Design a protein around this ligand. Structure first.
Ligand SMILES: [Ca+2]
Ligand SMILES: [Ca+2]
Ligand SMILES: [Ca+2]
Ligand SMILES: [Ca+2]
Ligand SMILES: [Ca+2]
Lengths: 107, 107, 107
């Protein structure tokens, strides 16, 4: 339970992409868990017009020493050329959870 | 509007569990509101295999002096032995809302 | 990619409201994108009892120098008298996304 936790946020065009990324990250012990939110609507401007499509969001939980590697890995395997890969540092968590996230991700 | 706000994030196995936690915290004036997200998929490893199940996520809003009390309370009533109870301190919010969160949770 | 990105979080009574706000912010180049989460349940106290209604949540992505302007604009156009408009500052993001958020919001 030594290391502080970090959150990673990213979006994917499909659920399968979100599941695949979560899987690859878990298998590499780069995260402890992922929360996948389905059917989010993403709205943005492309070519001076407002576009939207359906996506999944993911919250990834890991420790702060693994954040850069996890980001690099997501970037390497992401279906998007320009994905949102965003790091949020929580101010606190319950000790039992901090412990578990560390244990899951320790080599 | 004296105190700065904090967000708490947690997940539950069912919607009913999330409503219940939301409810109990509200009646104790430990939070001002809850946002419940349904049908999220959580992915993690157990016994060396990758598992997933469906959960609800919750964002809980309160003031910073109540975070520890609210976390302790969530731990005591949570269905999971090891729940994720995570605190994020926003850098800013609009005054009318900070005021409201304060008025809802102040003894 | 000069300026750091910031996140805004808010909720709306309907999806149409969330889409409308996203739209207005985009046409003013005050955000780079919106992620809209539908059919969330919001729980709070009204009239000394615990109430709930349906909402959408939105995560808005922009640059830090636009946060105040984006918040002011949201307050002016929001259907709620007391909206939650919350700023979260990520600790890190991938360069390509920072670059894009900056390019999208430049006049
Ligand atoms: Ca395999
Ligand atoms: Ca009762
Ligand atoms: Ca605090
Ligand atoms: Ca127009
Ligand atoms: Ca700022």
């Amino acid at each position: 339970s030594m290391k502080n936790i970090s959150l990673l946020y990213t979006t994917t065009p499909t659920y399968e992409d979100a599941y695949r990324i979560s899987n690859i990250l878990l298998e590499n012990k780069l995260i402890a868990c992922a929360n996948i939110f389905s059917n989010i609507t993403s709205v943005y401007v492309w070519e001076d017009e407002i576009h939207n499509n359906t996506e999944c969001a993911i919250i990834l939980k890991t420790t702060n020493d693994l954040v850069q590697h996890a980001t690099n890995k997501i970037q390497a395997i992401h279906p998007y050329d320009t994905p949102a890969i965003i790091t949020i540092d929580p101010t606190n968590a319950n000790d039992k959870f901090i412990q578990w996230v560390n244990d899951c991700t320790a080599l």
